[PDB]
Amino acid sequence: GPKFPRVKNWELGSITYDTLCAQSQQDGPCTPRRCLGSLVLPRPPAEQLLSQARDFINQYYSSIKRSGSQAHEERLQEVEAEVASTGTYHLRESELVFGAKQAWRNAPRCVGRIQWGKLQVFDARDCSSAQEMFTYICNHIKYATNRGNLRSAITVFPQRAPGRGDFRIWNSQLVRYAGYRQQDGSVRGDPANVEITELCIQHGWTPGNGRFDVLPLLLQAPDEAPELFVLPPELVLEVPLEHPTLEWFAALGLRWYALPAVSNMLLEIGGLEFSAAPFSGWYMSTEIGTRNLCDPHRYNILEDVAVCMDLDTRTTSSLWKDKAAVEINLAVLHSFQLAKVTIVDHHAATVSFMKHLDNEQKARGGCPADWAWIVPPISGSLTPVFHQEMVNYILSPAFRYQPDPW
Amino acid sequence: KFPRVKNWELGSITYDTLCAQSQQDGPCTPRRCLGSLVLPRPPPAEQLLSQARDFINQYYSSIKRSGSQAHEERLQEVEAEVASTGTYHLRESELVFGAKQAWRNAPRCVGRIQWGKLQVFDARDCSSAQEMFTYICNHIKYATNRGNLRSAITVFPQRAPGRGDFRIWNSQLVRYAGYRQQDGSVRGDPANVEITELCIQHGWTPGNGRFDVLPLLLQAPDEAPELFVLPPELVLEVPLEHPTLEWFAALGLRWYALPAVSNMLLEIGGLEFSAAPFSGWYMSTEIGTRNLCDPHRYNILEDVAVCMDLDTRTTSSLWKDKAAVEINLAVLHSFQLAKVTIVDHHAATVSFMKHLDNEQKARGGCPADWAWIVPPISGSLTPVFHQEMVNYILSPAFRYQPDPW
Ligand code: HEM
Ligand code: HEM
Ligand SMILES: Cc1cc(N)nc(CCc2cccc(CCc3cc(C)nc(N)c3)c2)c1
Ligand SMILES: Cc1cc(N)nc(CCc2cccc(CCc3cc(C)nc(N)c3)c2)c1
Numbered sequence A: 001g002p003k004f005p006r007v008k009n010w011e012l013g014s015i016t017y018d019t020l021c022a023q024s025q026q027d028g029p030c031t032p033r034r035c036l037g038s039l040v041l042p043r044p045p046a047e048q049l050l051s052q053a054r055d056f057i058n059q060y061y062s063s064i065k066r067s068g069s070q071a072h073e074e075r076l077q078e079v080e081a082e083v084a085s086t087g088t089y090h091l092r093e094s095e096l097v098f099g100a101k102q103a104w105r106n107a108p109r110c111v112g113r114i115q116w117g118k119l120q121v122f123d124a125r126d127c128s129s130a131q132e133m134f135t136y137i138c139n140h141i142k143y144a145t146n147r148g149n150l151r152s153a154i155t156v157f158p159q160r161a162p163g164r165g166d167f168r169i170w171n172s173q174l175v176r177y178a179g180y181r182q183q184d185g186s187v188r189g190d191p192a193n194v195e196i197t198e199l200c201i202q203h204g205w206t207p208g209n210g211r212f213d214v215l216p217l218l219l220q221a222p223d224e225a226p227e228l229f230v231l232p233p234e235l236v237l238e239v240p241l242e243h244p245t246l247e248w249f250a251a252l253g254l255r256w257y258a259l260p261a262v263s264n265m266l267l268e269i270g271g272l273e274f275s276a277a278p279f280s281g282w283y284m285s286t287e288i289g290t291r292n293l294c295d296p297h298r299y300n301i302l303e304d305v306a307v308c309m310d311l312d313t314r315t316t317s318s319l320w321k322d323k324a325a326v327e328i329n330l331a332v333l334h335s336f337q338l339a340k341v342t343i344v345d346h347h348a349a350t351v352s353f354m355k356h357l358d359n360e361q362k363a364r365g366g367c368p369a370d371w372a373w374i375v376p377p378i379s380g381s382l383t384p385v386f387h388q389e390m391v392n393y394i395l396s397p398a399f400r401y402q403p404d405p406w
Numbered sequence B: 001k002f003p004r005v006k007n008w009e010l011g012s013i014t015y016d017t018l019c020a021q022s023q024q025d026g027p028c029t030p031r032r033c034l035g036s037l038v039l040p041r042p043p044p045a046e047q048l049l050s051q052a053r054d055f056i057n058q059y060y061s062s063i064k065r066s067g068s069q070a071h072e073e074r075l076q077e078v079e080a081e082v083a084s085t086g087t088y089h090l091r092e093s094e095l096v097f098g099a100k101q102a103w104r105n106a107p108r109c110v111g112r113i114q115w116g117k118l119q120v121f122d123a124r125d126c127s128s129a130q131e132m133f134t135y136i137c138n139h140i141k142y143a144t145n146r147g148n149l150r151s152a153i154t155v156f157p158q159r160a161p162g163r164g165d166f167r168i169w170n171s172q173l174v175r176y177a178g179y180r181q182q183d184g185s186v187r188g189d190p191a192n193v194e195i196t197e198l199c200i201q202h203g204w205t206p207g208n209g210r211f212d213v214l215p216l217l218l219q220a221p222d223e224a225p226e227l228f229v230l231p232p233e234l235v236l237e238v239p240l241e242h243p244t245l246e247w248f249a250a251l252g253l254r255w256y257a258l259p260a261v262s263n264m265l266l267e268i269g270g271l272e273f274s275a276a277p278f279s280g281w282y283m284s285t286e287i288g289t290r291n292l293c294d295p296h297r298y299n300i301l302e303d304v305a306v307c308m309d310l311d312t313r314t315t316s317s318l319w320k321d322k323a324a325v326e327i328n329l330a331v332l333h334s335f336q337l338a339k340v341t342i343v344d345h346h347a348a349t350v351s352f353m354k355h356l357d358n359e360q361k362a363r364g365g366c367p368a369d370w371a372w373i374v375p376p377i378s379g380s381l382t383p384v385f386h387q388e389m390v391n392y393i394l395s396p397a398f399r400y401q402p403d404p405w
């Protein structure tokens, strides 16, 4: 065959070669000596910026089928002259739209990519206060939430400037429950959010005392202290959780919010960096039902639920963890459906990712995918992705992790 | 240089320094990770000699006699043999050390906490496929032990540059026939269609059940392979029943007791053992989840779920996840009832976590393959899911090798 990775699906016996990886311009964490594929995180001046800009502009003109043309070479020229005199440059409106989608398309760890082409891109590159950031975010939440008929969106605030503070959103997600450190070492609420909760209270937030207290937003305009904003409750749609047949489940008082809106990622496009570009899609049920509710280091509710189920938790072989997790996941789906709020179960999501893989094979000759992340945390081999070999690599545009602002 | 390895459940951190002793390139490069690929697509005296030096070193260190007379003189012996003959031979205790280390170094094995408890049968004085069969039967009888399974390996003659390999054609010592039917269908185990046809082409009379224990096709150098039927009484099987669902037993589902891989090459200090079958015991997900629920194996999930009267019309009723658990439960219960060793995936991974700990203290790390160590149901309900892992190749090692046909 060719000298590109051969890629096998073991369920179906089919083979593809990934030619897209040749486009990768950035090294990941692996070497021939050892694979670091399972680590969650592993570790601008003119020369560097310009070639990255050049690459992206090429990408753009390729996508509108005008590669090599006059409008393409002039834009190239327009870019290098702007870098020549200010040291940075700016994207045209449709370039941002293209690059933002491309970043979602390029994201190895997102199972939701069948939807990449359908993203609402809000340009907020005129935003100039923390207050204004709030407004923008509120509009984003209203739009995307669409009373339950969730719609994918991204709001792009202004880019990193040479010696100028960043636009940052301190919260890792637009909606997050509080995590209060107790005197008995324990945590009331979401243990994932202890630090940000503590940051909020330090910046003047009067705290609650519940397992599902919605956090305020800490929003930071350049060179300024972060300002604190409460989201009006009518804007934050939540779903109380109940089970289709286990009647007692409604009595646990569990709930989740509708809009999964990540806010601490860096969005890189042709070398430009947008430190505040929160984006939102809709949940896969396992995120809430398996990770958020059952992780030993989150809500940790598995024992509570299995007791109500009257299962034998004294021993592992009764599969009590497995039984409860299934019921909790099904409660997530049932309650989301009932409330008429968009959700996708881990089966549908994975099937649709297989179709996305097939599209991308036809379109780009491959698709970067992080197997450990794409395969769900329950019912793994029950879904088709488990049986699909994946190649992982960094394409740009991209979303990156970035340091916390404090 | 040294990767930072983090457990996200507990926030704890370690550093793998062991991976520096890796001498053998895997499939990844800085440009792209290939960690999810299942397989990768006389060695000049210099190379055999240095792999051998390294192995002997490991061995004399393992017995704390590193640098003594017996150490130097055994290096002499190896230097003498390679120089004269282009190869050398292992002493039984060294072979015994090698095997255990190959198990220890197996990144895709969740059972390594047991790595030091391994019965090693030297079969290197085997000259016929007939003799291989005798050895294979003793191994089975030993390893099964009336249901109280004991880890074991039998090691057949090494490879030799002149000649064909000693090989076991079957991929496990015990396997159920897969028969392709006219109607594109498969009766029995779809993984074993090829090997069933081979048996038939070499004169096996096939049954036609869903669970026909296949015969061994055993091959001595440069001779046609030979057919040998395992005496039904050496093959312990467990019928499947369910703790609460009375109807489950009527499905007539069954699985064998002894998981005994037989197609992997074992490399020790540069010598290659092309037939070296090994067995431990099962982890339930292998039978309950993969073997019975894989769409391309027995594929029983729909059947079961209908028995359970679940809504099969839609994915969001979680009929697959619900049926899957019942099947893994049926498996554990049935083995526990039949007094045959089995570990559920919670117990197994908890113990693997501990093994990761022992190895850290012992060696500065543990090569591990995250995609294989995390079980195929309830991944994140297990501690291994939250554990970062460094994968690489240490020697002694089990490798894959081509099919002998
Ligand atoms: C439309 C519905 C969507 C679904 C069902 C979905 C699904 C997921 C899931 C399950 C994860 C794993 C996260 C975790 O386990 O914590 C993920 C990661 C990710 N998602 Fe999506 N997503 C969707 C929309 C989007 C959108 C609109 C974007 C951005 C435009 C996006 C970008 C990403 C990125 C960049 C990651 C990687 C995060 C990391 O590196 O840790 N997704 N996605
Ligand atoms: C004693 C109990 C044992 C348990 C519970 C256990 C468990 C497992 C499991 C679940 C796998 C993945 C299996 C699959 O999905 O196909 C595996 C792989 C493996 N096991 Fe173990 N194992 C045990 C003993 C042993 C022994 C005795 C050896 C050899 C001395 C061994 C060597 C290996 C090797 C080399 C692999 C890697 C297979 C590959 O790379 O394809 N294991 N083990
Ligand atoms: C749009 C969207 C849809 C969906 N269904 N789920 C999500 C959640 C994805 C998600 C969740 C937590 C966290 C991240 C980014 C991880 C992350 C990022 C940074 C900057 N630092 C860290 N320490 C960790 C991404 C997002
Ligand atoms: C010792 C042991 C214990 C246990 N619980 N299960 C097993 C079975 C695991 C098992 C089964 C078939 C085969 C292998 C490795 C050989 C192997 C070889 C090739 C070419 N492809 C594969 N997918 C696998 C491993 C073995």
Ligand SMILES: C[C@H](O)[C@H](O)[C@H]1CNc2nc(N)[nH]c(=O)c2N1
Residues within 6 Å of the ligand: A038, A039, A040, A372, A373, A374, B008, B385, B386, B387, B388, B389
């Ligand atoms: C150690 C491991 O990389 C880590 O636990 C990963 C595994 N896979 C995951 N997959 C998804 N989708 N989300 C996650 O948070 C994780 N966690």
Ligand SMILES: C[C@H](O)[C@H](O)[C@H]1CNc2nc(N)[nH]c(=O)c2N1
Residues within 6 Å of the ligand: A010, A386, A387, A388, A389, B035, B036, B037, B038, B371, B372, B373
């Ligand atoms: C393609 C993917 O790597 C493949 O399906 C792997 C995943 N993890 C596995 N894990 C185990 N234990 N056994 C397997 O066969 C597999 N298959």
Ligand SMILES: [Zn+2]
Residues within 6 Å of the ligand: A030, A034, A035, A036, A037, B028, B032, B033, B034, B035
């Ligand atoms: Zn890798």
